[PDB]
């Protein structure tokens, strides 16, 4: 779930939130990371 | 088991400092230079072998249980506290001052 | 010490539940004794095997939180007695002994 | 495996009590914890102390300072000495074999108390 | 095996700089990893465990742990109960626990058919090389060795993994030998080789019931289901008389190394991980971590079948030869485990750091495992044979005694060339096969380099080849 | 290119325990012995002890045994020194050191920045 | 009804790559140096 | 891969064992080597 990094107020880096696995298979974690636009495509 | 004799040795820049160290054990000795406000650095190891980056002014050792560090031509980067290590023991230390 | 009711009363043929409780009773085995007037307080609930207490018997014991229940099946007039529980300290520095509960069958 | 007690019929007030208990025809008295209990007639029963053949002893912390327990390792007899006992402290004194069953190595703590299976008798000796 | 004594060879050995220890270490790691690789990866086991204590029905090393485990089908999960040791299970978040190496490193299950029994391994040089065995009965481990012999390869060295105590293997021939790179250097380990072994009778008395479930297609997970009998704890026994005599021998040798009026104290390992603070060893495939405080609990002052029982904890998830990212799960073995080992040596660490002398304290130190193999390879040095010599002369153009005359003068050593020249081609598991291939290729390469040198010198088959080169007095 | 980074600026009262870290960099942490050394003006530098990763073995100086504990995290390349009970004589700068050549760990060519501890 | 693939509970089933064909091709087995293959 | 290279090394080792054995016999360079060993009539 990616949004633009933006300048906080107004509109190459996408701030992506996703449900990633953890060291335990039963548990997941919410991860917020910055990817480059060239590293992601739309679904 | 490791006694350093000079204590607070005094010399002006450019003079030669002789730092004795009486050892009660056999084993490789090392000399360390500690500047005020800075961590100690190794200057001599294995009795008379210079640590990397150390100017040639640092040398001196003997086959007997008496080591004698010779520090010639002292500069502004000198005049710290010199320690004499043999295994775990470092000796009292000798402050080098003008 | 281990707090016990001063008395219990059941009808013959019913199952009696004599309880005791205390902090050191949660970690150490609880032994039970049956004392008749004029006779020694012989064992009724003994420990056998490190992982069960079990022991085929008419009696039986249940551990629950800080309370240990002595369950006596088929109570008859022959079972009228003073029932006591005992357990060791959490460091086994002493044995703590309960005040006893008098079981009467009427 | 029988237990039979012995002691004086009367003791003085505020005087040391001395009791003994004889173990008969058992095979391994050295495994068990030999113990004494005290009961006030008509009232609650309490443990006073015990001793093992390995030299370990324990005593009830409220009584410990006045009670000493010994055993004879040559003659199978169990002795109790209680300093300055009076009427408010006394009661019937019973000896018992707090039997110990060994499940693993005793040096590692792998023994569990079985309980006071075999009991003697006692008399509330005082004054 | 044919051992050839070298009559007057004095050879400087250094067990602390012995390449056989580094090579054996690398080989043991490679063999461990290769035997463990084609086995269950246990990725599904890194789950949140609902662990309660194993209880006595009336009331804690083992924990009964409930997990939602995978099955052969990915859409279905099964609830699995399994008894894990406290040392394998880390508490996270009351009742929620996970395995010790699930947050860091991956835990590979050992294949259930794989045996962990050490079998003696003879480390053998390729032809063209030889191993020099030092036979000095009281050998320090470093310095000149007077009684030297050559072998193609060593005695059988069991790849025994142990830490504080050295189990099985070679004993000293006359007395306890205290070997250290520098006994005055407290950062070096002291390898004690005993002349008498101390028998250590060790057991996991628990009658563990081993269950097996699938955790994926073809992935069988082996675990403890229940304990049929009493829980107890694992333990090792050594007799008081034999161990106390062993420590007496050790202090006598340390007093030979130190002052004769020095008080020598043995004390428990002051710290470190379980592989260092306990005596970690494999007992029939199970992994024991013995407290060993009761062995090293003594102060020696310079002047009955009663056993010392060492508590031992058992681990199923083992990270031995500690490495980043690696871990192994050792499956439980059905029934009761007992093994009887010989303690043939010790690894001691001296504390030092004191200017108040007359007292020294020696604590066990597991250290690395290169010391366990060094304690067996201390007699051995690997040397490359240089069969081509040149010497001034007056010319103008069985494997017994293979390296004999090495310590003898020339001339006498020129009459043995036939036996030395022979056996230079043949000598006196992917990992082992590649090492055999490297050894054979290397032996052929060196044999042919020497035969080629003889060819281009015109000496292809003379063995003693006189030449037309005048001897230059500047050479010798 | 070995640089030891210590966490410091720690001041404590007598009777409290200290715990200071040393992060390793520039070399394989798990394969080389680290040492803790205490330096103070007018006193002989006192070696606190060595910690040897790939096992985590420790060697505490005799006068400190029972008070000094050392541990490490090989997955964070970090060593820790802990003193259970501080006194006024423990005021000093605590240094994390490594030998020039891991075969001989006493030639302390690599020193950390140091942690002043005032008690 | 509920079914599973026949070998999922016993083996790790590997899908053949779609470019790979199973048509047989002649394979000639040859003697290494120092050896001969004799034909009858 | 490994087994084929082992086969190559074995071929080399067998070649060298035959050449070494001929060298021991003083025959390494002759291919047909006549030497001073009488033939026993028992050997067919
Ligand atoms: C390292 O060094 C260590 C230190 O040296 C060493 O430690 C030793 O370890 C071993 C185990 O490895 C320990 O062995 C245990 O020993 C216990 C005690 O053994 C003695 O007593 C029993 C009981 O016999 C009583 O009754 C007879 C009948 O007449 C009397 O003759 C006896 O004296 C005794 O009576 C006493 O009590 C009476 C009660 O009033 C008194 O009146 C009387 O005066 C006495 O005090 C004997 O059987 C033993 O002899 C037998 O020993 C073995 C077989 O057990 C044979 O080789 C031998 O020939 C004899 O037959 C001995 O005299 C044992 O109780 C204990 O047995 C349990 O564990 C084993 C495990 O191996 C099980 O197989 C066995 O079934 C037992 O388990 C039952 O009992 C335990 C304990 O209660 C329970 O926890 C368990 O759940 C199970 O209960 C089941 O049975 C119960 C009935 O028994 C029943 O009530 C339950 O409901 C349930 O059904 C075991 O043998 C040994 O003691 C250690 N030593 C020390 C000093 O600590 C270690 O091994 C060394 N390690 C290494 C690696 O080298
Ligand atoms: C380094 O080396 C030194 C020198 O060897 C060691 O220190 C020495 O330790 C020994 C071992 O104790 C001391 O000897 C005597 O110890 C007893 C106490 O005995 C302990 O161990 C026995 C083990 O058999 C155990 O029975 C004892 O516990 C029983 O008694 C306790 C009484 O307080 C009681 O609390 C406990 O629950 C238990 O009784 C219960 O069980 C019995 C079973 O028989 C049962 O009958 C009873 O009713 C209860 O249920 C106790 O743990 C002391 O009494 C002696 O005075 C004496 O001390 C040495 O003295 C000691 N030496 C020094 C200088 O300190 C170190 O430990 C060693 N270090 C390490 C790390 O190992
Ligand atoms: C130091 O050396 C000693 C002596 O060699 C060694 O102790 C021995 O260990 C082996 C392996 O554990 C023991 O042999 C076992 O005996 C039990 C008896 O019940 C068997 O069940 C075992 O069989 C298992 O392994 C087999 C592998 O071939 C499997 O086929 C089988 O199914 C089982 O899984 C096995 O035979 C041997 O008895 C002891 N010796 C003594 C005297 O007890 C010791 O372990 C070595 N030290 C170290 C640290 O390794
Ligand atoms: C511990 O390590 C030392 C190396 O640091 C080992 O060698 C010893 O080295 C010292 C010099 O550092 C030798 O000193 C000797 O001194 C006398 C008197 O001056 C002189 O006559 C000798 O020629 C020599 O220089 C010392 O002898 C040497 N030790 C030995 C046994 O030769 C030391 O050996 C190591 N200790 C042990 C117990 O292995
Ligand atoms: C893997 O699954 C097969 C199929 O379930 C098992 O083999 C048997 O298959 C027949 C098919 O008619 C069933 O009636 C049997 O009940 C199956 N046996 C069992 C024991 O389930 C096969 O055994 C399974 N493999 C394993 C290792 O359990
Ligand atoms: C060791 O050698 C003795 C003779 O030594 C030889 O001559 C002396 C002068 C030195 O050059 C030395 O290197 C030579 O080896 C023998 O008598 C003695 O038996 C030999 N010892 C053995 C084989 O143990
Ligand atoms: C990010 O900004 C660009 C600007 O062109 C816009 O088209 C795009 O929709 C924005 N994306 C999100 C996720 O807000
Ligand atoms: C994570 O999973 C939850 C499940 O309720 C979902 O609501 C949430 O949107 C997911 N988050 C992301 C970042 O995809
Ligand atoms: C397990 O035993 C430990 C012993 O310290 C105790 O603290 C813990 O509460 C016990 N847990 C359960 C679930 O009984
Ligand atoms: C398995 O998953 C279910 C999901 O509802 C959960 O409630 C349960 O606690 C899990 N079981 C274990 C043993 O973790
Ligand atoms: C070498 O062996 C001989 C016996 O062959 C022995 O007398 C001598 O002491 C040994 N040398 C050493 C240094 O151990
Ligand atoms: C051990 O070292 C000492 C150092 O002085 C030496 O004299 C002695 O001969 C050495 N021992 C052996 C067996 O080589
Ligand atoms: C073992 O070494 C000791 C060292 O003191 C010695 O006294 C003893 O005789 C030796 N015993 C054997 C059997 O080798
Ligand atoms: C143990 O040592 C004895 C001599 O003490 C020896 O005879 C025996 O072979 C050794 N056994 C093992 C298994 O190492
Ligand atoms: C150990 O076991 C052997 C047989 O395996 C037995 O004969 C011996 O008495 C035991 N010794 C010790 C010291 O535990
Ligand atoms: C673990 O819990 C399960 C729950 O069903 C029980 O059956 C099993 O016996 C327990 N195991 C132990 C060792 O208590
Ligand atoms: C060990 O030997 C010493 C000899 O100095 C003796 O005094 C001591 O009592 C022995 N210790 C044990 C535990 O047997
Ligand atoms: C071993 O036991 C001693 C006391 O018996 C304990 O203090 C020590 O921490 C234990 N060591 C380990 C590594 O568990
Ligand atoms: C474990 O218990 C089972 C119970 O049936 C028994 O058959 C088996 O022999 C026991 N094993 C051991 C090693 O005591
Ligand atoms: C002998 O050696 C010297 C120095 O290497 C060299 O100059 C000289 O030419 C050599 N003599 C002959 C005869 O080759
Ligand atoms: C998590 O992993 C780190 C190493 O990355 C380790 O130090 C830590 O102890 C683990 N966590 C727990 C709770 O044990
Ligand atoms: C021939 O064979 C006989 C068999 O008895 C033997 O005695 C004789 O020495 C052999 N001669 C030669 C030349 O090999």
Numbering used by the authors:
A (entry chain C): 130 to 140, 153 to 184
B (entry chain O): 3 to 27, 30 to 91, 96 to 106
C (entry chain E): 3 to 9, 11 to 95, 95A, 95B, 96 to 107
D (entry chain D): 2 to 35, 35A, 36 to 82, 82A, 82B, 82C, 83 to 100, 100A, ...
E (entry chain A): 81 to 139, 152 to 185, 188 to 309, 312 to 323, 323A, 324 to 398, 410 to 503, 518 to 548, ...
F (entry chain N): 1 to 52, 52A, 53 to 82, 82A, 82B, 82C, 83 to 100, 100A, ...
G (entry chain B): 189 to 228
H (entry chain B): 572 to 615
Please give sentences taken from the publication describing this entry.
In influenza HA, the anchor region analogous to HIV MPER joins the ectodomain as flexible linkers to three transmembrane helices and allows the trimer to tilt in relation to bilayer surface. Both Env MPER and HA anchor have highly conserved epitopes for neutralizing antibodies (nAbs) making them attractive targets for vaccine development. We included two other HIV bnAbs: VRC01, which recognize the CD4 binding site, and BG18, which targets the N332 glycan supersite.
Using the model of Env gp151 MPER ND complex, we were able to resolve novel structural details of the 10E8 epitope including a binding pocket for 10E8 antibody framework region 3 (FRH3), formed by Env gp120 and gp41 subunits (inset 5). To confirm this similarity in engaging the binding pocket, we solved the cryo-EM structure of Env gp140 (BG505 MD39.3) in complex with BG18, VRC01 and 3BC315 Fabs to 3.1 Å resolution. 3BC315 engages the binding pocket mainly with H100A, G100B and Y100E at the tip of the CDRH3. The observed similarity of the binding pocket engagement led us to propose that these antibodies may share a common mechanism for trimer destabilization. This would normally occur during virus entry associated Env rearrangements that follow CD4 receptor binding.
